[PDB]
Design a protein around this nucleic acid. Structure first.
Length: 187
RNA sequence: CUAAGAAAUUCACGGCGGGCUUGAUGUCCGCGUCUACCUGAUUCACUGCCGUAUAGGCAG
């Protein structure tokens, strides 16, 4: 994956950039479940780790045929007025390589309590005795908010840009474009 | 380095007895409250799955 395509959120008087970034990420995810495979990687070039902000840019990492297919496919319908685009081009080098991975946290003690009750046949009080409320961990990481279509929930999807490395390795990506082993050029 | 420097108010106690406040009364005419707006700031940290696990991961 030596090719990239930058997408920057146009400023909108109607919307904040986080809402636009989340609906763009959901539509990219739906485009990848429509496409299939594990070869599509994402990034956030104007990231702010300190303020936990994604920035205002998103960058896809793939081959050029994937970029020209995704630049005209109807997952960009209704956002071309919200979005300005670049051109499908080759990445610069030398670049450090890092991973973009979805991090999940045990954020609700009661759901894991109900799982322990389902898998150990305990009552509610044994689940509260075995699992306290200190267990709940909150991440200090930026996030998109996503509407599931299988189930009906709205959940925060916390992303982590991994450590910078001098070389990249093989692997795939999930249907959200996040690394389950793959690496992306970071520039 | 202070109108500086010091100090035991305290023992006891029956306030109760009794009573007619009454009659009478017109509130009342009148009234232009308009004008214009993003409740959305990621604001639903959720639901489940693997794992003996609370340790750690995974899905949408």
């Amino acid at each position: 994956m030596d090719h990239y395509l930058d997408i920057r959120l146009r400023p909108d008087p109607e919307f904040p950039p986080a809402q636009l970034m989340s609906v763009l990420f959901g539509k990219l995810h739906q485009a990848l479940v429509a496409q299939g495979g594990d070869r599509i990687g994402v990034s956030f070039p104007d990231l702010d780790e300190s303020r936990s902000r994604l920035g205002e840019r998103l960058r896809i990492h793939a081959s050029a045929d994937d970029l020209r297919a995704l630049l005209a496919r109807p997952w960009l319908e209704g956002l071309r007025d919200h979005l300005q685009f670049g051109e499908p081009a080759v990445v610069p080098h030398p670049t450090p390589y890092r991973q973009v991975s979805r991090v999940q946290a045990k954020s609700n003690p009661e759901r894991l309590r109900r799982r322990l009750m389902r898998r150990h046949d305990l009552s509610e009080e044994e689940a509260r005795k075995r699992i306290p409320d200190t267990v709940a961990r909150a991440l200090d990481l930026p996030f998109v908010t996503l509407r599931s279509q299988s189930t009906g929930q709205h959940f925060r999807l916390f992303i982590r840009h991994g450590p910078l490395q001098v070389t990249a390795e093989e692997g795939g990506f999930t249907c959200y474009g996040l690394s389950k082993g793959g690496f992306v050029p970071w520039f």
